[PDB]
DNA sequence: CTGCAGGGTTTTTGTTCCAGTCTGTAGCACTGTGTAAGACAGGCCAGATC
């Protein structure tokens, strides 16, 4: 299964659809493989009615960052 | 029916190149702290003395 392979073997398996995503994002979306596959995953999540996971992913890949704000972290430290 | 020698197959796990790019950690300067080794004091008993 794709989730249990290593990243090297997963790339060896998925490189074809990878380069198809590359050429599609270059043809239509300014060559942004990042945002294209991001919105693809977002909509594939939202289709199953998994609204909490997709809302949390939209909250993560924008605005707030890694779990804590570095400012408040230093605030605690001091 | 059975035994391994060993053929195929993907998968994995390396893996070779450069660049990075973060990171931990081992520097570095520092002075404050706790100790144990060693100087040395003295008193004091034994040895030498009167």
Curated annotation (Swiss-Prot):
Residue ranges the UniProt entry marks as DNA-binding: 1-62
Where does the protein end up?
Nucleus
Lineage: superkingdom: Eukaryota
The entry's note on the tissues where this protein occurs is:
In the adult, predominantly expressed in the thymus with lower levels in the pronephros, mesonephros and ovary.
The domain comment in this protein's record states:
The RING-type zinc finger mediates the E3 ubiquitin-protein ligase activity.
Q: What does this protein do?
A: Catalytic component of the RAG complex, a multiprotein complex that mediates the DNA cleavage phase during V(D)J recombination. V(D)J recombination assembles a diverse repertoire of immunoglobulin and T-cell receptor genes in developing B and T lymphocytes through rearrangement of different V (variable), in some cases D (diversity), and J (joining) gene segments. In the RAG complex, RAG1 mediates the DNA-binding to the conserved recombination signal sequences (RSS) and catalyzes the DNA cleavage activities by introducing a double-strand break between the RSS and the adjacent coding segment.
Q: Oligomeric state and partners?
A: Homodimer. Component of the RAG complex composed of core components rag1 and rag2.
| Family from the record | Belongs to the RAG1 family.
Designated name of the protein:
V(D)J recombination-activating protein 1
Origin species, per record, is Danio rerio
């Amino acid at each position: 299964h794709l989730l249990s392979l290593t990243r090297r073997a997963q790339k060896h398996r998925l490189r074809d659809l990878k380069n198809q995503v590359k050429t599609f994002a270059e043809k239509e979306e300014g060559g942004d493989v990042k945002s294209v596959c991001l919105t693809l995953f977002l909509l594939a999540l939202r289709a199953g009615n998994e609204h909490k996971q997709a809302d949390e992913l939209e909250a993560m890949m924008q605005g707030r960052g890694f779990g804590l704000h570095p400012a408040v972290c230093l605030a605690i430290r001091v």
